[PDB]
Structure formats: structure tokens, C-alpha cells
Amino acid sequence: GLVPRGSHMLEAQVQFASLWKRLVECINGLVNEANFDCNPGGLSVQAMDSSHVALVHMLLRDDCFVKYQCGRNSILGLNLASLSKVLKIVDSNDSLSLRHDDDSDVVTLTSENPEKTRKCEYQLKLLEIEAESMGIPEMDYRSTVTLNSAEFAKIVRDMQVFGDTVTIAISKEGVKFSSSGDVGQGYTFLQAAGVSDRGVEVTMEEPITLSFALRFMGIFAKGSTLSERVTLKFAKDSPCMVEYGIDNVGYLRYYLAPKVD
Amino acid sequence: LVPRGSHMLEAQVQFASLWKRLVECINGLVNEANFDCNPGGLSVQAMDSSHVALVHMLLRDDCFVKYQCGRNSILGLNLASLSKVLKIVDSNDSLSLRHDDDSDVVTLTSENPEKTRKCEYQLKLLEIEAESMGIPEMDYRSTVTLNSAEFAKIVRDMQVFGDTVTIAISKEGVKFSSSGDVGQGYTFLQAAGVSDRGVEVTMEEPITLSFALRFMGIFAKGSTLSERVTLKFAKDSPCMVEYGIDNVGYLRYYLAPKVD
Amino acid sequence: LVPRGSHMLEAQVQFASLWKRLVECINGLVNEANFDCNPGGLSVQAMDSSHVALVHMLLRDDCFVKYQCGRNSILGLNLASLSKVLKIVDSNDSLSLRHDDDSDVVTLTSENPEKTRKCEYQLKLLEIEAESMGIPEMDYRSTVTLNSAEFAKIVRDMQVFGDTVTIAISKEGVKFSSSGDVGQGYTFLQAAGVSDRGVEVTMEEPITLSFALRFMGIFAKGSTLSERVTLKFAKDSPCMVEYGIDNVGYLRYYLAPKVD
Amino acid sequence: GLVPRGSHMLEAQVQFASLWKRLVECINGLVNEANFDCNPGGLSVQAMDSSHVALVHMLLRDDCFVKYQCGRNSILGLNLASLSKVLKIVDSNDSLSLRHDDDSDVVTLTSENPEKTRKCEYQLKLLEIEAESMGIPEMDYRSTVTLNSAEFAKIVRDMQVFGDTVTIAISKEGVKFSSSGDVGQGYTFLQAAGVSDRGVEVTMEEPITLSFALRFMGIFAKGSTLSERVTLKFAKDSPCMVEYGIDNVGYLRYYLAPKVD
Amino acid sequence: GLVPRGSHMLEAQVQFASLWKRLVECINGLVNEANFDCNPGGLSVQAMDSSHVALVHMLLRDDCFVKYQCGRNSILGLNLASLSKVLKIVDSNDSLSLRHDDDSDVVTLTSENPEKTRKCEYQLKLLEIEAESMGIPEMDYRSTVTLNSAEFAKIVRDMQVFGDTVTIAISKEGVKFSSSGDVGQGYTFLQAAGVSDRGVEVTMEEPITLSFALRFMGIFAKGSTLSERVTLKFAKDSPCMVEYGIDNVGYLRYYLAPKVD
Amino acid sequence: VPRGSHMLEAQVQFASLWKRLVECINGLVNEANFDCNPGGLSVQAMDSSHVALVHMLLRDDCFVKYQCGRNSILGLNLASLSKVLKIVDSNDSLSLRHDDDSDVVTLTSENPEKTRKCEYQLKLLEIEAESMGIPEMDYRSTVTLNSAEFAKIVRDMQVFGDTVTIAISKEGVKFSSSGDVGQGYTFLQAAGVSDRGVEVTMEEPITLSFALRFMGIFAKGSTLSERVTLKFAKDSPCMVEYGIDNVGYLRYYLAPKVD
């Protein structure tokens, strides 16, 4: 429309800061620095734990924000430790505008009350983070179980009293989480209770039984702060995946290698 | 006409909160103990490593929604572990404790009202001797009964001063006293009129004993089981602190007095 | 018995929560302090071990349901201990502070509305040398008043960044600022004139001073006593933060500025 | 025509009390009460830990004592805790006569200096300790390693900084102790023998690799107070054994179940 | 006449500070504050435990010190807890000059190496400690036993594994220390010996048997740090006494009430 | 292909060095970064209250074998590292090794006689760059004394207060403290010429005060050097230096106490 532009603003603001708070918590659990791809499609974070066993892919679609503006595709490295420290002090119900200028070695967070009587502005030095080394697995999922996010969280926390490894067994009827160790042996069995209305949606293709490091399942289960339900997808000798939907305006997705023997 | 398949103990309580609250109490005093299961119910009797204090707990068979102890088996358990497992069991779930014929393992089974979740934990069991220490007896000259939680507060409070509390019983009240660096404290409770909360003294003479707060503290955890608590005393004799479980049982602690 | 004298000094407050909340506040700054008791009321005046910051607290005599300070006695107290004792005293119980002649010990007496419980604690007293001071006054050009708890939050917040906060006052609002490894933060508060919510700025010129957050933090504990809090400033001069104890007293802190 | 009765049942005196001291310490580590079979063949103690995972067998042959007398086979239950408390106060270099009478409900320990100017006498109430009496596994020990008792002790203490489980791997050419946990991963490898000619006397039949609870290895390693060397014997899916010889006049032998890591 | 008239002073220097260190330790065991009478005859301390069961009397004659000066008779109250804290840091082989100006209220300790390269000076605030209400008791008439100080110390420590009360029985033969409790029953018997030093010098008039609180005997036995030998004196239904000679320039003397029917 | 390398390998002959060092520095901070240049290993780190700073350097000639062609930074949990070094024999060798992107560093110990070999592996951090920079240059007054006397003197002064006052004079140096117990001082005379035995070398008289908590942490240095050197400057961080020399140093810096 007879109008050009060489500079950047890259300013996106969410209405309720509680979202960012709850997210960073989740992902800081896994890694302490990460890149923030901002496309016009929305913000993504893709990052892998220092042991290259687990992967976290988070996407916040552009309809997630009350205002969003990412002309070109800039990438922003951030210290998540610091970012968490700042978000810890930001009121849940305040707004939060994340902003970056043309090349400015610094990103800025701006918070404001509903009533406009208080305004906060924090500035973080940015990094410096080498491209992710990749990559996401592809990869087709035979069996799929969906359950209350917080029950899931409880179950991992519970299983950890026994071991540092959980064994997940899927049957059409239900799913069984199992653990062993000094204290003894535990299991929690969840029945599938069909055909409607909400409470465990198994949907397998065959029986399938994999094992996983609880350390990481625990880090993932933090997701329950974002979604009332959570979905786990499995495939034989293949990374499982745990998915937490954000309100149709995004997702948080974790992938973890099975234990091998 | 028909025996088999076997095998021989099942004890299910409706609300797991009971077991949770109990084990907490008794774990405070000892870290392993034997679980006599008669057809009369489950008892635990055990003494602290310094042989100064004694727990006796009994859960009568009417305490359980379902109970079955044909012969009298004894089950040693690590209370530390048992506590760890009970910590993860929902208060309002059921909890069936089960053991089979010579099975080196006892099993705890929890289930929702609603039957959509089922949990099952298994603990290796121990050979614990099975131990000497003889339960002592009355007569109990003086007897005081009070709100369980006030009692709890009072010990916690007295511990800011010393590691020893002095309990003095008088017609119309009881006085808990302590000393130490911080200074000197006392709490006095009056008796007389309605005693429900509210302090039912019922002495025979005045009587004044002293006790290790470390242990009174361990006992006071009992407040999680009974709104009220009863203390019984006798000169130069182990006092006793009793917490009733709903008429279906008791938790009873006994502690030696301090000497001068 | 006619030295004279004599001799007792009784100061009872209705709700012990006050004393609890106070001692907490001031224990944050110093661990022993003198309690001047005039017939005018109790004052505490004391300075931090680095001689950077000063507390002045006054509880007027109309603060107490019952007060008696014939002559002007001074009572040194270990605040650490006093805090330990007040921690155990129920918020809603009464609390009579009492001293006799010449009795090396002050006594705290608590009682519940319903008179069924009575507590009595005794503290050895000190021995505290007069405070080289003083107090500064009073030439406060422009000030600011805000919600006590917002203030508290703001300090706690600013500490994630630095150990120093910079307070900038302007017609319009006030800006708290900090720097450090994590980065740079500020919180700006807006409002025009004099009205409670939310910020009554009332300056004479713009003025910008800096302070040690360590101490602002200690002060902010005041939010337990007063919904609002007032800060007064003067160029190259100790600021002051004031917490009104309703209409019966105050808690006031003064802190040296930073050159920077 | 001889003398008939009495008195009296048992007298067992050792020259240097240091032995008893060092023994009880060892075994008190495993159990807090135990039975003392006194045959004319000597004193034995056989006892098992409360979890029925580990077994002590100690034998002091009759030639171990300067004077020994056990006509019939009496059994004496003892609180090892108490016994330890008493032995703690008995001088190493004093004599120590253990005595029990016909009736009695009490055993008596009597200590005396070389120079006869001091005499101590302690009396312990004895117990009825029940079975068992399991009482011992055998035999076919495929692989066998022998090493300095104190190095062994160090090695367990060391491995415990990592985990609560040690993995022992035996090869021609040496033995490798391994552990894992939060702190990280450790191993100690001992070479020899041989490494001709000649710790560490390995003498295997095949390679063999078992794991064990360090809690118990630790309890055992206390044995180093009795013997300069220590011998470990193993067999696949079978209780290992750790043996400490007493001067040809006896042994202390521990047996421990393998772990499933 | 060559005579002044002053208002001052007190200086008491010992060559080896180890003495003061070892003393204060002994006494601090019994009480935490005490008065230090300084005569020209020497320093005495007389004090009684908070339960008025046991009494210390210590005297350091003026020939004990390399330099001593107590013109008039001043009294100095001291916190023994603090004094112990300061003496803990003073080298055993350094000198130690204790001194007081007059009414200042502070006493000063001054330490110096043999080689004069280091000098330490500590100052303690002094107390008003109220005069000692209790009279020393009197009639020590035999029985009397003397023995190695450290054997004595051992014997109390030993007897405490059993009870909190020791029973001392004196006979022409020897002396018997006895105790009872949960652990069981112990005794130690010492025979009256030998060649040099006889090695236990009993010197009774009749047999005599009293009992005592081990708590206090223990506190006393700390005296073994000052004298190789120790002497105990008894009288029926009368405070015993335990005396530790320094060996000729002073004494430390404890008195303790017997236990009664 | 003449190699690079590649890698990192740093072996010391006697492990006692590493043991004694980590102890010292673990006293101040529980995690720290290990810059490995070809110049040697340095650690630079600051206490959580940003009052005190530790700089340690081990020059490359310190090691029987050293190889850091290029640079790499290794974060380490010092608590864990201390736990592992606690079990390593003083007189064993100790090779510290790291491979290309390996999330783990490895410690390898071996006896003189090659009959025992130990290998421990630590997960690595994750520690954000140090920030607060080294100060310079004190310049004016300087005292040097027996490391252990110094250690004693701090431990001693702590019975009184939590603050020590150091006064330097041509005569000597005076350490002073106050508190409930009372008041102490220790005075050291300048003896000489060399060595304990106290080498004062001032420019004017100068008197500063310091937190004993930290002087205590530093004094642990006496395990590395028989002597220790303190340098001061008015209203300026003092410094306490322990020199392995010429192989390396351990250096602490601490803020003075202000009015």
C-alpha cells in the first residue's frame, strides 16, 4: 500500500501474565537458556536437556496475544533462570508486553495493572545461543492416552517414592504406572471407563509397555498448571511425547527417550 | 464344606486418613514395629531406643469395614517406609492391608470412592524381636483430660524454654512449667464448670511430676486422632497419655518421670 | 517498700497481636533494645550495629487498656528472646507487661477472652548502654504515602536485581529502580494529589535519592501494622519511613542515603 | 573315684580382651541380639539381619581361649547393644573370662590386668532369643578374590558417596567395584593377580559380575579390625560370602544376597 | 622509712598457661561463675553447684606464680564460661599474666611466647557475684584412699555405662566401685598393692561404704589433668572429699554429699 | 594433520593439591567455573553476598601433563567435587579430563605402583558468567606472615566478635576484636629480615576492619602455603594471597567494613 519499513519493534503483549509465569516455570525445569523464534505465526521455543534425552517444543500462536507484531523472523536467546526470577515478581493479573528493538542487545518486559495506576518495566540482556543442534522426532503414534493433568502429576510424584524409573503399561481397559526400589513396589492403575462424557481416554492399537526416567516425567508434569488434561503418545522403541494444550492458542510438548535394555 | 484357595489376613478401612494419621504418630517414636493381628484386631506395642517411653496402639476389629485374621500372625514393618507410602495415599480413598500364607511381603491396596483409580503398594516385611518391655499399670491417682490440640500447643510452647516440663495437678486446675536460657514459662488451665472443649481434672491428691518434652512432643501428634486427650499420673510412676479412636480403638503412650 | 519507689509498672494491651507484630518489626533491625516507660507511654529508640539506620517506636499510653508508669524506668530486653516468647502467645489473648522493684526480671502475662487459660512468662533483663543519639529532624521537602504492602512487594521485587534501590519523586508519580546481574527493573506508581488507595505524592521539587535494600526490607515489615506507609525525604538527608499504629502510636525508621 | 559336681556350666577366658571388643563391634553392626552356642568345640554365633538378606556366622574354636570349658551344649541369648557398651569400657590388654552357672539368668564377664592389681566384673541379663537357625548356604564358589581387609573397607566407604549399591566385576587381570548416584559415578579397579607372581589374589573360573547393598558390605567391612586380609567368594545368582579369618583359632563369615540392581 | 601508701593493684603471672587452662576447665565443669579471692597468701576460689550438693575449693599459693602481687585483699567475680573461651585460645606454653587495676571492673589477661615475638591481651568484664553462702565441712577423719588420677577418671566414666550412682566400698583389702542400671551391673575392684607407688594406698580405720552421684564424680575426675594421683577421704553420713594436689604450690578440692536412705 | 587437540587433559602428580584447593574455595562458594586456557586453569568466583571474591590460578607448569589447545569453561558443583576428592588418596595421581561436547568431566586417580585405578565422573553445570570484576591495585601497605599463625589469629579473634580490626604500623601489626565475652588483641612484632618473623612493608600507618566469617574462610589457605600475604589500601578491598609459586596462586579479596 505504497508504504515500506526497515526498523523492528517486535512487540507482543498477553493480557494475563500468569500464562508466561506458568510457562517459563515449566520449561526452565528442563533447560536454563533457550531461543525464542518469533515468526508472524507466533513464538516458538525448541530446546533439549543437557543430556540430550528430552526435548521441549512450545508454541504460542499469534491469536494467543492481545497484540502481536513479528514482521521478519527474529530469534532471541534468553537466560531462563533470570527470566523466571523476573516473572516471579510480576502479578498474575497484570498485562505483559514483551518487546525488542531493531538490534538492541536487550529485550524488555512491561507490565501494567488493569487500572493503569502501576507500571513495571524490566530489561534482560540477551544471548548468544547456538542453534538447537535439532531435531524433533516425526514419528507416528500407535497408542494414545489422555487423562487429568494433575492426576498425572500426582502419579509421577507418587511413583518417585519408590524408584527413579516408571513403567507405563497400556491396555484397552486402562493404563498402569509401576515403580520399584528400596521402599518397595508401587503401582497406580487407571480404568478407561467408556463410552462418554469426560475419566481416562485410552485409544490404543496394540498393547504396549515402555519405561521412562521419572526425573523428566516430573519436569514435564509441571504442565498441569496450563491444561486441565494432558495427553501421552507412545510408540515401540520410540520417544514418547507428552502434550499440554494451551486454550487452542498454543501447545507445550515434551518428548522423552525410553529406557533401553 | 470347602477350604482353599487361601491365604490368611485382610484388613480394610474405609478412609485411609486413619492409617496415615496413626503411622505418623507412632513413627515419631520408633522406626520399626510389629503388627500383631488377632481376630480381636491389630495391636502395636513398642518402645523407644532409649527404653524411656512406650507406645501401645490397638485397633479393634469393628474399626474396619472388613476384617479377617483366622490365626494370630505377627508382621514386622519398617515404619519409615510405611510412612513414605501412606504419605502418597489419598486421605479419602479406601485402604486394604493384606498378607498371604508365608509371603515375605504385605500389600496395601487403595481405591477411590468411584472405582476409577486403584493403587497397590507392597512392603517387604521384617523379623523384629518381638520385644520384652512390659506394659506398666495403675492405680492412676490423678487424671486430667483436655483438648488434644491445646495440649499439643502447650508442649510446643514449653519447648522454647527447656527440654523438661513440670506438670502440677491441683483441685481446679493444671499447671505446665518450664525453664531455660530464654527464661521461664508457665501455662495454667482452670477446671471448674463445664469442662468440655474445658478441662476435666479428677484427682485424688495434689501431685506434681516432670517429663522430657522431646517425648511429650512425639505423643502430642496424637491430636490428629482425637479431639480430646487424657493424661493419667501416679507418684514415681510412668504417666500415660491416651488418645481414643472413635471407640474402635486407642493410642496410648507411657513415659517415665524425671528424677530428683 | 520505700526506696523509693515503688515499683511495678503495668502495661496491658487487649490484643497481643500488636506486640507480636511490633517486636518482629524491630527485631529485624537490632537484637536488644531499651524500653523507656514514661507515664506518656513506651518508647523504643535504637540503631543498627552499622549505625546507618535508626528505629524509633512509640506506643502512647491511650494504646493500652491499662497503663501505669509513675516514675520513668528503663528496661533493656533481648529482642531475640522476646520474639521467641511472643511467637507462642495467641494473637487474640490479652498481654500484660509488668515490672516490680527492683526486680532483674520483667513478666509477660497472657489471658484468653474467656479466662480459662492463663500464661505467664518471665524474661531476665539487661544491661544496655544508652544509644549514642539523637534522632534527626525534620525538614522534609515533599513526601509520598502509599499502600504498605505494595511498598513491601516493591522492595522484595527490586532485590532480585540489586542491593540498592533508587527512588525518584516527580509531580505525577514515584519511580523505584534497581540494577544488577539479572538486569534492570523499575516500578512506577502514578496518581495526582492527596487521596487514599493510589499514591499521595506531595513534593516541593523533584528529588532523587538511593538506599540500601537490606534495610528498606527490614522496614517494610511494618506493613503488618498499618495499611498505609509514609516516606519523607530531604536532599543529602536520612529519609524516613513511618507506619502509624492507628491513633495510639507510631513506628518510624530512618535511613542514611547512598552516594551514587 | 573322681569328684562329681558341680558347679556350674561354662568358663571361656581369652588372654587379650581386644578380640571380644573387636568382634562384638563387627557383629553388633548386623543384629542387636544373638545366641551364643557354647559346645566343647568352641563358641559359635549364627544370626541373620532383620530383613533376612544377610547372615553372620562367627566361630571361635576352643584353642582360641587360654581356658575353655563347655561340658554340655548350652545356648546363651545376649543383648549385643549392652554387651558392646560393656566391652567398650574393658581395657584391650586385660584378660576376659566369660562365665555362666547352672541355674542362672545371667552371664558374667570378668576382666583382670596383667599385674593383678585391678579386677572388673560385669553381669548381663540374658535373653530368650527365638529361631533361626536358617542356617547357611553353600558351596560352589566359582570365583574368589582376596585382598587387603582395610582397602576393601575404604573401597566400600568410598563407593557409598555415590550410591547404595555396588557392582563387583571379576576378570582375569583384576576386580572392579562400581557405583552410581546423584553425586555421579565412581569406580575403583584393582589389578592383580596375575600379574605374576602374586591385594590381590583373584582366582576365577569365568568372568562374573554381581551387585550388592553397600549398607551391608559396610557392616561387614568392619571385619578389617580382625584380619589383615579378607576373602570374597561369589557364584552366579548366589549369595556371595566375605570371610575374615581369626589367627587360625576361628572365623567371621558374612553372606549376602545379590541385588537386582 | 621509705614507705608509700597506694590505691591499686593486682598482678599474677604464671610461667606456663597450661595450668590456668587445665584449672578453669575443671571448675567450669561445676559452676559457670565464681569469685577469685586474691590475698597475699595466693588465689582461692570457693563455690558450690546450683543444686547445693557439691562444693569446689581451689587454692593457688603465691609461690605458684613467677610473679605475684596482692597488697590488700580484692575479690574478682568472673564468668567462667567466657574465661574458658579465652583460655581455650591461649597457647599452653605461653606465659599468662592476670591483672587488675582497682575499681575499673575489668580484669586483663596477657600472654606472651618464650621468644617475645607475639603478645596477646584479652580483657574480661567482671561480676558481682553474691558471697558464697556455704561453709566448707570439716572432720575428715579416715578412711582414706589414694590412687592414680586417670584410673579414677576411667573408673567413673566406666561406672556411668550402668547407672547414675556409684557405690564405693573401702576394705583393708582394697576398694570396690559398683554400679547398676538397665545395661546390667558392674564393679571395679582395686587391690592395695604393690612396689611404687602403693598401686593404691588405702589407709582406713574401719570398713566404710558410701554412695554418690556419678554426674559429680565425673565433673571432679577432670582433675586428673592436674595431678598424677588423687586422694579421696570419707566419713560416715558425711561429704566425701576428692583432692588433687598442684603438686605443692596449691590444691583443687571437691566435696560431695552422700546419697541417703 | 598435526592434531590440535581437541579435548582437555590436566593431570597433577600429587592429588593432595586438588584436595586442599577445593576445600579452600568450597568454603566460599558451592559452584564455580573452571576456565581452562592453554595458560592454565583459573577459577574466579564471588560469594553469594557479593562481599568477597576468590581468584585462583594454576599455571600449566603446575601439571605433569596439560592440554587445553583453545578454550573451554567447565561449571562444577564444588560440594560434589569435594565429596569425591575427600575419597582420593593424597599421594595418588589425578587426571582431570573433558571431551568434546560431553556434559561430564572425569577424574582419574592412580597409585604410584599402578595396581589401583579410580575413575569418577561429574555432571557439569550451567553456571552463568561471573560478572563482578577483580579490583586493583592496593599498592600501599603489605604484611606477610606465617599462614597458620594467621589462621589461629582469626579463629582466636572470633571468640570475641564477628569483626576484626587490623592496624598496621612500622612496629608491627595488631589484630583486635570486641563482643560479649570481652576484648582481645594479638600484636605481632616485625622481627625479620626473613622469615617466620613478620614482613611488614608499609607506606603509611593504615587501619581497616573486616568480617571474620570471611577471613576464616580464607585462612584455610594455610594448607597450601607456609606463608600468607595481606595487602591493603584505604577504603579498598584488602587481598589475601597464598602462593603455590611459581606454579600458581590462591587469592581472596574482601570489602572493608564501612563506618
Nearest-angstrom CA–CA distance, A77 and A107: 10
Contact of E208 with E236, CB cutoff 8 Å: yes
Chains touching F, CB cut-off 8 Å, 3+ pairs: A, C, D, E
Q: Please, are residues E174 and E190 in contact by the beta-carbon 8 Å criterion?
A: yes
Which three cell numbers mark D73?
551344649
Q: Look up residue A207 and give its DSSP letter.
A: -
- Secondary structure letter of residue A31 according to DSSP: -
Cβ distance of F103 and A51 shorter than 8 Å: yes
3-state secondary structure chain E: CCCCCCCCCEEEEECCCHHHHHHHHHHHCCCCEEEEEECCCEEEEEEECCCCCEEEEEEEEHHHCCEEECCCCEEEEEEHHHHHHHHHCCCCCCEEEEEECCCCCEEEEEEECCCCCEEEEEEEECECCCCCCCCCCCCCCCCEEEEEHHHHHHHHHHHCCCCCEEEEEEECCEEEEEEECCCCEEEEEEECCCCCCCCCEEECCCCEEEEEEHHHHHHHHHHHHCCCEEEEEEECCEEEEEEEECCCCEEEEEEECCCCC
Question: What CA–CA distance (Å, rounded) separates E216 from E26?
Answer: 11
CA dist D29 and D24 (Å) reads: 8
| Contact status, residue B176 vs residue B187, Cβ threshold 8 Å | yes
Distance CA B61, CA B11 (A): 9
d(CA D36, CA D24): 12
E66-79 burial, b at 16+ Cβ within 10 Å, e below that, comes to eebebeeebebbbb
For residue D43, the domain's CATH number is: 3.70.10.10
Residues of chain A with C-beta less than 8 angstroms from the C-beta of C188: 118-121
Distance from C-alpha of A190 to C-alpha of A177, rounded to nearest angstrom: 9
CA distances to A18, B64, B71, E159 from B74, in Å: 54, 18, 10, 38
A224 Cβ contact list (under 8 Å, min separation 6): A149, A150, A152, A153, A230, A244
Nearest to E194 by CA among D47, D113, D78, D210: D113
Residue A190 distance to chain B (closest CA, Å)? 5
CA nearest neighbour of D190 among D243, D145, D253:
D145
Q: How far apart are CA B128 and CA B126, in angstroms?
A: 6
Q: Do chains D and F touch (3 or more CB pairs under 8 A)?
A: yes
Nearest CA in chain E to D116: E191
- DSSP secondary structure code for residue D257 in this structure: P
Alpha-carbon gap, residue C20 to C86, rounded angstroms:
5
CA distance F24 to chain C (A): 25
Find the chain A residues whose C-beta atoms sit closer than 8 A to any C-beta of F.
Answer: 32, 50-52, 79, 81-82
**Residues of chain E contacting F, Cβ within 8 Å:** 82, 85-86, 88-89, 106, 116-125
Residues 6+ apart with CB under 8 A from B132: D127
Residues B177, B185 contacting (CB under 8 angstroms): yes
Contact C181 F259 (CB under 8 A): no
Does residue D153 contact residue F86 with C-beta atoms inside 8 Å? Answer: no
CB atoms B187 and C119 under 8 Å: yes
Do residues D167 and D209 lie in contact, with contact meaning Cβ atoms separated by under 8 Å? yes
* β-pair partners for A111: A96, A120
> D149-159 vs D214-221: helix axis angle to the nearest 10?
150
* Technique used: X-ray
Q: Which residues of A touch B121 (CB under 8 A)?
A: 184-187
| Paired strand residues for F227 | F146
Contact D117 E186 (CB under 8 A): no
Task: Give the C-alpha separation, E216 to E50, whole Å.
Answer: 12
Record the cell numbers describing residue A102, joined without a space.
531493531
Measured between CA atoms, the residue of chain D closest to residue B132 is D127
Q: Name the residue type at position F258.
A: V
Partner residue facing A188 (CB), from B119, B123, B124 = B119
Determine the Cα–Cα distance for residues B35 and E63; give it in Å rounded to an integer.
Answer: 71
Strands B66-68 and B228-234: unpaired
Beta carbons of C107 and C98 less than 8 angstroms apart:
yes
Question: CA nearest D178: which of D192, D193, D194, D162?
Answer: D162
Residue B224: DSSP 8-state: G
Q: Calculate the alpha carbon distances from D130 to C45, D35, D71, D75, D76 in Å.
A: 71, 9, 23, 11, 11
**What is the number of domains present in chain C?**
1
Instruction: Please name which of B13, B16, B11 lies closest in space to residue B93, comparing C-alpha atoms.
Output: B16
Return d(Cα A31, Cα A63) in angstroms, integer.
Answer: 26
Angle, to 10 degrees, between the axis of helix F78-86 and the axis of helix F16-26?
140
Other chains touching D, judged by 3 or more CB pairs under 8 Å = B, E, F
Q: What is the dihedral of CA F241, F245, F250, F254, to 10 degrees?
A: 20
Judge contact between E12 and E79, C-beta under 8 A.
no
The CA-CA-CA angle for residues F221, F222, F225, to 5°, reads: 95
> 3-state DSSP helix/strand/coil percent for chain C, to nearest 5?
20, 40, 40
Q: What is the CA radius of gyration of chain A?
A: 20
Contact B69, B20 (CB under 8 A): no
* Listed residue (A239, A252, A178, A210) closest to A30, CA to CA: A252
Q: What are residue B196's DSSP bridge partners?
A: none
Residue the block writes with cell 599462614? F147
Could you tell me if residue D28 is left (phi over 0), alpha (psi between -120 and 50 degrees) or otherwise beta?
alpha
Amino acid making up residue A244 = Y
Name the interface residues of B facing A (CB cutoff 8 Å): 81, 84-85, 87-88, 105, 115-124
Rounded Cα–Cα distance for residues E190 and B72 (Å): 54
Contact residues for C64 (Cβ-Cβ < 8 A; gap 6+): C11, C12, C13
Task: Quote the cell numbers at residue D108.
Answer: 558374667
CA A43, CA F167: separation in Å to the nearest integer? 61
Distance from CA of A184 to the nearest CA of F (A): 28
Q: Tell me the three cell numbers of residue F146.
A: 606465617
Which domain range does residue B57 map to? Answer: 1-260
CA C196, CA A203: separation in Å to the nearest integer?
Answer: 59
d(CA F78, CA D183): 11
The number of angstroms, rounded, from the C-alpha of D23 to the middle of its chain's C-alpha atoms is 6
CA distances from D240 to B225, D212, E50, E151 (A): 47, 9, 59, 45
**CB B211 within 8 Å of CB B258:** yes
DSSP string, B177-208: EEESSS-EEEEEEE--S------EEE-SS-EE
Instruction: State the cell numbers at F130.
Output: 561471573
Q: Which cell numbers hold the place of E177?
A: 566401685
* Cα torsion angle, F19, F21, F22, F26, sign: positive
Q: Where are the alpha helices (DSSP H) in D70-223?
A: 80-88, 149-159, 214-221
Amino acid letter, residue B80: A
**Cis geometry, peptide bond prior to residue F246 (ω within 30 degrees of 0):** yes
Phi-psi region of F103 (alpha: psi -120 to 50; beta: other; left: phi over 0): left
How is A80-128 classified by DSSP, letter by letter?
HHHHHHHHHTS-TTSEEEEEE-TT-SEEEEEEE-TTSSEEEEEEEE-B-
Residue type, F178: S
Task: Determine the residue type at B257.
Answer: P
User: Residues followed by a break in chain F, C–N over 2.5 Å?
Assistant: 196
CA-to-CA distance for E179 and E155, rounded, in angstroms? 11
Chain D residues whose beta carbon lies within 8 Å of the beta carbon of residue B124: 51
* Nearest residue on chain C to A87, alpha-carbon basis: C157
Q: Which residues contact F113 (CB under 8 A, 6 or more apart)?
A: none
The residues near E117 (Cβ < 8 Å, ≥ 6 apart) are F188, F189, F191, F197, F198
Locate cell 588423687: which residue? Answer: E230
The grid cell for E203 is 589407709
* Residue from E214, E192, E193, E220 nearest E55 by CA: E220
Per the CB < 8 Å rule, is F259 touching C52? yes
Which residue of B156, B183, B198 is in closest CB contact with C81?
Answer: B183
Closest CA to E79 of E23, E131, E127: E127
Nearest Cα residue to D251 out of D96, D106, D49, D46: D46
Judged by DSSP in three states, A23 sits in helix
* CA torsion through residues A161, A166, A167, A173, sign: positive
Q: Is the peptide bond before D132 cis (omega within 30 degrees of 0)?
A: yes
Bridge partners for A35 per DSSP: A77
> Cell numbers at residue B144, please?
486430667
H helix or E strand, kind and range, residue C169: strand C164-169
Axis crossing angle, helix E149-159 with helix E214-221, rounded to the nearest 10: 150
> Cα–Cα distances in Å, from E99 out to A53, C192, E105?
72, 70, 11
Residue D2 φ/ψ region, left for φ over 0, alpha for ψ in the -120 to 50 degree band, beta for the rest: left
Cβ neighbours of F100 (radius 10 Å): 9
- How close is the nearest chain F Cα to the Cα of A205, in Å? 38
> How many Å from the N-terminal Cα to the C-terminal Cα in chain D?
66
| Contact (CB, 8 A) for D90 and E154 | no
Q: For residues D188 and F118, is the Cβ–Cβ distance under 8 A?
A: yes
Q: Which of B59, B53, B5, B106 is nearest to B213 (CA)?
A: B53
Taking the C-alpha atoms of residue C91 and residue C110, their distance in angstroms, rounded to an integer, is: 10
For the record, the C-alpha cell of E7 comes out as 590505691
Unique residue bearing C-alpha cell 527404653: B51
> Looking at the partner chain, which of B156, B182, B187 has a beta carbon nearest the beta carbon of C84?
B182
Under 8 Å between Cβ of C219 and C238:
no
Quick one: cell of D62? 576352643
User: At B176, which amino acid appears?
Assistant: F
Which DSSP helix (H) or strand (E) runs through D185? strand D185-191
Residue from B188, B195, B201 to probe the interface with C (highest C Cβ count within 10 Å): B188
Q: H/E/C letters for each residue in B6-40?
A: CCCEEEEECCCHHHHHHHHHHHCCCCEEEEEECCC
